[PDB]
Design a protein around this ligand. Structure first.
Ligand SMILES: Nc1ncnc2c1ncn2[C@@H]1O[C@@H]2COP(=O)(O)O[C@H]2[C@H]1O
Ligand SMILES: Nc1ncnc2c1ncn2[C@@H]1O[C@@H]2COP(=O)(O)O[C@H]2[C@H]1O
Lengths: 50, 100, 50, 180, 48, 197, 100, 50, 197, 13
C-alpha cells in the first residue's frame, strides 16, 4: 500500500532561561530564578565581578 | 575542559570508539571540514597496499535521545603523526580527553 | 510548569508565564472581542490572536 | 556586525571544502571584533580572498571613513589553495544586547535565503573599576578623588563617554530639578 | 428553517406556475445583497 | 519555451468551471498565467446586469493590471467558464526575474496595444453601426476567431443567440428577428448552431 | 486511487507556497514555524452535502469545489527552526517523481 | 541614541513632612543608581543650625 | 537627468500649433517625444467624421507602437495644438538605445493600463448611462484632472463647451441642456466656467 | 538635584 516516502529534518537551538535546571559534581542541584545584569552584580576591589 | 582531574579521563576518552585514532603514524595529506587524508609511513606501509587512509567525519546527527552529533580535527596538516594518536575531537572531547 | 521563587511577591500573588493563562482564558476573550467587535465573530478573533 | 552573508551557503549547519572551521565558529571569530565608524550608524563591508593560510582583517575591503581597530583579529584558515571566499558584512550602530533575534522577532519581513542573522553586543566596554582616594586641598582633606579604571573595545574615546555621562545624567536630572 | 426542501414544479402546482422568473428574481436578489454591504457577514465564512 | 521557464517558478492551481477566480476590488498581490483553458472577464452594473469585457485563451496573463503600483485592487470579476489551470507567481519575485529576463514585456505590451486598439474598434462599432451592423460585424469577426468549425460554405460555430448578445448588447428575441432577417439575405444559417453562409 | 503530492492545494495563501518547489516541497536554507506547510499532499476524496445555510453561502459567492482532500504536512504548534536536510524513498516499481 | 525618561507621576502627601513619591518610567539599572546617590548626598551633605 | 542625455542626440524641432505631423497610413519610421507642449491624437472614419482619442503633454512619447515591428503604417493623426518642442528618434537607433539602457517600457505600459481602464469605463458607461450620467462622469473627472481651479467650496473648471463637445464626442447642445438640468439640481453652477459643489 | 547639577557644571563642557 505504501508507494514512496519522504522524510525531513530541521534544526533547532536552545538557550538559557529561568526554570532550567543546573548542577555540578556533588548532588549540588539548583534552578535559576533570575539572571543578573552585570552592574548590580557584587564585585571586588579590582571591579572583576562575580 | 575541567581543571581538577583524576587521571583516568584520557583513558576514558578513547575506547568509546567515538573518534578516529592513528591506525598508522604518518603525515597529513589533505584536510576538509568533513574529512582528511594521510600518508602512511613506509615502515608501517605494506608492499602491495598504497598505504594511505581517508577519514570522513561525523557531522550533525542524532541519538536515540536525539541530540547533535559532530566530529572535527584537533590538528593541522603537513605534520608528523605517531600511531595510536587521535585525529579529531567530538561533541564533548578535547585532545583525547573528555570535556562535557 | 517548572517553578521558581518570587522573593518580592506578596501573599495573593503568583508568577505566571503568560501563554498559559493566554490559551486558558480564550472564550472570555472571544466573547470580549465580539463585544468590542474588532473580532465581530470568532474566526477573525483567532486570526487576530495569531 | 549585525549580519553577514556569503557565496555558496544556505544555513549555518552546512560546511565547505578546503576549510577547517564551521560557519558558526567563524561567526564567533567575528563577534570579538572592533570597529570605529565615523559618520554612519550602519554600513556593509565586503571581503574576498583566496590562498592557503590565515584570513585576518588585513584581507578585507576597508572603506576610508571608518577606523579598524586591529589588523589581526583572526577569523579563519584556508586549508586548500584553490578555495575562494566572498562575503558581505552588515554593521550597524547601537548599544547593548538586543541581538537581532529581537529583530526577526519584531520583523517577519520576508527575507531571502543566505542572510545570516548574527547576535549583536554593541556594548564596547569590557572592564571598569574606581577608587576613592583623597582629593588634596590643604584644609579640606575630607575631600575625595575618584580614579576610574577602564577597559573597552576600540571604537571609543574616554572623554567622549565621560561628557556623554554628564550629558545624560543631567538630562535625567532635569526631571529632578525642573519637573519638580 | 425547515425539515423540507421544496423545489420547482410543485410551487407552480402550489403557488401558481412560474419557474423561470424565479431564477430571475434569484439573480437580482444576488445583486441587491452581494454588493459588499451585506456580503461581509459571509466574507469571513468565505474563508470557511 | 519561455512559457515553461515562467512556469518553472509557478504554483499551478486548477479551477473547475464557475470558479470565480478573482473578485474585483480584491487587492492585487498575485500574478496569474493561464496554463490551460479560457476564462471570462466580467463587470457588473452596480445594480443589475454584468457584462463580459472579453474572453481570453491560452498564452496570456491575468491580474497584470495592479502590478506597477501599490494599493492596486482587482478590476473585474473573473469566472471559469471552462475548467482551467492557472500558474501562480507573485510580485517582486517577478520584478527580479524581469531584471533577469526580457521578452515578456515585449509580447505583453504589444498585446496591450492590441487590447486598446480593439477597444477603440469596439467603441467605434458601438458609435457608428446600427445594431444589425453590430451583430453582423460580430458574425464576421468570430468566424475568424479560432473557434470556427470548418464549413465548406461559410464557418460554423455553436452560438445560441446568447453571447452574440453579450458581445453586441441587446435583448435576445430581436436577435431572433434579425437572424430571421439575415435568414432572408442568404448571409447566415442556423439550427441553434450557426453558419455564416 | 493513489494519493499524491504536489504544490497544488485549494484555498491557499501563497505565503506558505512561497517556499515550496514545483513538486510542492520546501527548499533548503529556510526557517519555519508552527502552521507552515512542508509538503503538499492530497488524497482522492469522495463527495458529501451540507446544510442550507452553507448552501446559501456557496450559492452567492459561487463557491466551487473539487473531489479531493488535503493531507498536507505542517509544522507542529509551538515549534520553529531552520531547514537544512531531507530525503526521499521510492519503490523499485514506482516512477521516481522528478526531484527524487 | 534612543533614551527614555521618567515623569513625576504623583506626590502622595500624607503630611507636610511625611510624603511619598511615585516615579516612572526608567530604563533598567537606575532606580538603585538613583536611590544610592540620592540617599548618600542627603545623608552626607546638608546645612542647618543646631 | 537621463532625459537630457537621451535628448542631446535627438533631432529637436519646434512644431507650432495645428501642424499635422502624422498622417496615419504613413509607414512608421521615427519615434517622437513631447519635450514641451500639448498635442491631440485623433482618428477619422472614411466619411470624414473624426474622434479625438487623447491629448498628450510634455513627458509623453508617440510613434511608440510602430518601433517594435518593422514597416507598418502609422496609427492615428497627431497634431500639435500648441507650440511644442519635439524630440525625434529614428527607430533603428532607438532600439540601439534600448540595448544600451532598459527601463523605458514600464511607464508606457503603466499608462496604457490607465488608458484601457478608462476606455473600459467609457464603453461601460456608454452601455449604461443616458447622457445625464455621461455628462456626470465627464464633469466629475474634469473637476479631477490637474487644471481645475477651486471655487472656495467647489471645483472650478473653465475648459469650455466647445472642448467638452469633443471630449465626450457628442452634441454640445444637449450638454448645455443637461447642464441646465443639473443646475436645476444645483450640484453645478455654470456660466462659461462650471463650479462643482 | 540642583546642587548636583551644580556639581556637573564642569563637565557638560
Ligand atoms: N476590455 C478588455 N478586453 C480584454 N480583457 C480585459 C478587458 N478589460 C479587462 N480585461 C482583463 O480582465 C482582467 C480583470 O482584472 P485584472 O486586474 O485581473 O486584469 C484584467 C484584464 O486581464
Ligand atoms: N482609446 C484611446 N484612448 C486614449 N488614447 C488612445 C486611444 N487609442 C489610441 N490612443 C493613442 O493613440 C496612439 C496611436 O499610436 P500608438 O498605437 O503608438 O499609441 C496610441 C495611443 O497613445
Amino acid at each position: 500500500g505504501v508507494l514512496k516516502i519522504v522524510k525531513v529534518y530541521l534544526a533547532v537551538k536552545r538557550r538559557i532561561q529561568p526554570g532550567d535546571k543546573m548542577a555540578g559534581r556533588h548532588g549540588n542541584k539548583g534552578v535559576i530564578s533570575k539572571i543578573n545584569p552585570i552592574e548590580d552584580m557584587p564585585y571586588d576591589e579590582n571591579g572583576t565581578p562575580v | 575542559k575541567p581543571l581538577v582531574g583524576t587521571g583516568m579521563e584520557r583513558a576514558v576518552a578513547v575506547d568509546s570508539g567515538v573518534t578516529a585514532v592513528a591506525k598508522r603514524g604518518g603525515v597529513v595529506q589533505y584536510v576538509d571540514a568533513s574529512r582528511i587524508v594521510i600518508k602512511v609511513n613506509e615502515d608501517e606501509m605494506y608492499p602491495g597496499e598504497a598505504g594511505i587512509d581517508i577519514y570522513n567525519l561525523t557531522k550533525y546527527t542524532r541519538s536515540n535521545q536525539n541530540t547533535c552529533i559532530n566530529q572535527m580535527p584537533c590538528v593541522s596538516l603537513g605534520e608528523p603523526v605517531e600511531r595510536g594518536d587521535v585525529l579529531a575531537d567530538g561533541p564533548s572531547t578535547d585532545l583525547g580527553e573528555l570535556a562535557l | 510548569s517548572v517553578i521558581t521563587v518570587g522573593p518580592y511577591l506578596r501573599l495573593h500573588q503568583c508568577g505566571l508565564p503568560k501563554k498559559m493563562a493566554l490559551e486558558l482564558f480564550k472564550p472570555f476573550i472571544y466573547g470580549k472581542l465580539e463585544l468590542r467587535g474588532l473580532a465581530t465573530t470568532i474566526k477573525a478573533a483567532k486570526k487576530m490572536v495569531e | 556586525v549585525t549580519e553577514v552573508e556569503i557565496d555558496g551557503v544556505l544555513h549555518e549547519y552546512s560546511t565547505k571544502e578546503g576549510v577547517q572551521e564551521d560557519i558558526l565558529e567563524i561567526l564567533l571569530n567575528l563577534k570579538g571584533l572592533a570597529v570605529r565608524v565615523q559618520g554612519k550608524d550602519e554600513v556593509i563591508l565586503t571581503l574576498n580572498k583566496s590562498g592557503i593560510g590565515p584570513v585576518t582583517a588585513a584581507d578585507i575591503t576597508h572603506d576610508g571613513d571608518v577606523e579598524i581597530v586591529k589588523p589581526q583579529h583572526v577569523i579563519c584558515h584556508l586549508t586548500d589553495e584553490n578555495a575562494s571566499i566572498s562575503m558581505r558584512i552588515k554593521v550597524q550602530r547601537g548599544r547593548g544586547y538586543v541581538p537581532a533575534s529581537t529583530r526577526i522577532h519584531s520583523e517577519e519581513d520576508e527575507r531571502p535565503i543566505g542572510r545570516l542573522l548574527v547576535d549583536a553586543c554593541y556594548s564596547p566596554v569590557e572592564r571598569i573599576a574606581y577608587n576613592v582616594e583623597a582629593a588634596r586641598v590643604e584644609q579640606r582633606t575630607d575631600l575625595d578623588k575618584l580614579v576610574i579604571e577602564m577597559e573597552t573595545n576600540g571604537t571609543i574615546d574616554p572623554e567622549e563617554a565621560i561628557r556623554r555621562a554628564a550629558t545624560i545624567l543631567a538630562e535625567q536630572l532635569e526631571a529632578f530639578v525642573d519637573l519638580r | 428553517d425547515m425539515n423540507t426542501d421544496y423545489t420547482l414544479e410543485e410551487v407552480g402546482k402550489q403557488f401558481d406556475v412560474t419557474r423561470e422568473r424565479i431564477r430571475q428574481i434569484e439573480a437580482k436578489a444576488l445583486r441587491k445583497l452581494r454588493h459588499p454591504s451585506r456580503s461581509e457577514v459571509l466574507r469571513s465564512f468565505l474563508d470557511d | 519555451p519561455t512559457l515553461e521557464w515562467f512556469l518553472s517558478h509557478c504554483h499551478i492551481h486548477k479551477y473547475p468551471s464557475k470558479s470565480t477566480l478573482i473578485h474585483q476590488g480584491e487587492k492585487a498581490e498575485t500574478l496569474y498565467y493561464i496554463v490551460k483553458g479560457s476564462v471570462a472577464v466580467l463587470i457588473k452594473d452596480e445594480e443589475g446586469k454584468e457584462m463580459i469585457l472579453s474572453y481570453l485563451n491560452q498564452g496570456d496573463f491575468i491580474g497584470e493590471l495592479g502590478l506597477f503600483e501599490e494599493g492596486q485592487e482587482r478590476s473585474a470579476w473573473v469566472r471559469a467558464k471552462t475548467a482551467c489551470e492557472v500558474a501562480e507567481i507573485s510580485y517582486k519575485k517577478f520584478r527580479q526575474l524581469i531584471q533577469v529576463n526580457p521578452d515578456i514585456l515585449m509580447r505583453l505590451s504589444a498585446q496591450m496595444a492590441r487590447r486598446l486598439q480593439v477597444t477603440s474598434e469596439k467603441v467605434g462599432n458601438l458609435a457608428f453601426l446600427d445594431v444589425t451592423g453590430r451583430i453582423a460585424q460580430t458574425l464576421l469577426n468570430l468566424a475568424k476567431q479560432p473557434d470556427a468549425m470548418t464549413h465548406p460554405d461559410g464557418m460554423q460555430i455553436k452560438i445560441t443567440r446568447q453571447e452574440i448578445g453579450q458581445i453586441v448588447g441587446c435583448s435576445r428575441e430581436t436577435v431572433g428577428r434579425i437572424l430571421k432577417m439575415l435568414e432572408d439575405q442568404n448571409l447566415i444559417s442556423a439550427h441553434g448552431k450557426t453558419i455564416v453562409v | 486511487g493513489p494519493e499524491e503530492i504536489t504544490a497544488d492545494i485549494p484555498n491557499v495563501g501563497e505565503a506558505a507556497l512561497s517556499k515550496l518547489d514545483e513538486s510542492g516541497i520546501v527548499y533548503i536554507g529556510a526557517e519555519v514555524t508552527g502552521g507552515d506547510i512542508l509538503v503538499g499532499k492530497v488524497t482522492p476524496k469522495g463527495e458529501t452535502q451540507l446544510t442550507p445555510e452553507e448552501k446559501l453561502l456557496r450559492a452567492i459567492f459561487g463557491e466551487k469545489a473539487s473531489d479531493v482532500k488535503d493531507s498536507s504536512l505542517r509544522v507542529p504548534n509551538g515549534v520553529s527552526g531552520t531547514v537544512i536536510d531531507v530525503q526521499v524513498f521510492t519503490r523499485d516499481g514506482v516512477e521516481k517523481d522528478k526531484r527524487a | 541614541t534612543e533614551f527614555l525618561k521618567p515623569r513625576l507621576v504623583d506626590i502622595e502627601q500624607v503630611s507636610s513632612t511625611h510624603a511619598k513619591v511615585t516615579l516612572e518610567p526608567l530604563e533598567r539599572g537606575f532606580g538603585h543608581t538613583l536611590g544610592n546617590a540620592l540617599r548618600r548626598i542627603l545623608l552626607s551633605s546638608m546645612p542647618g543650625c543646631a
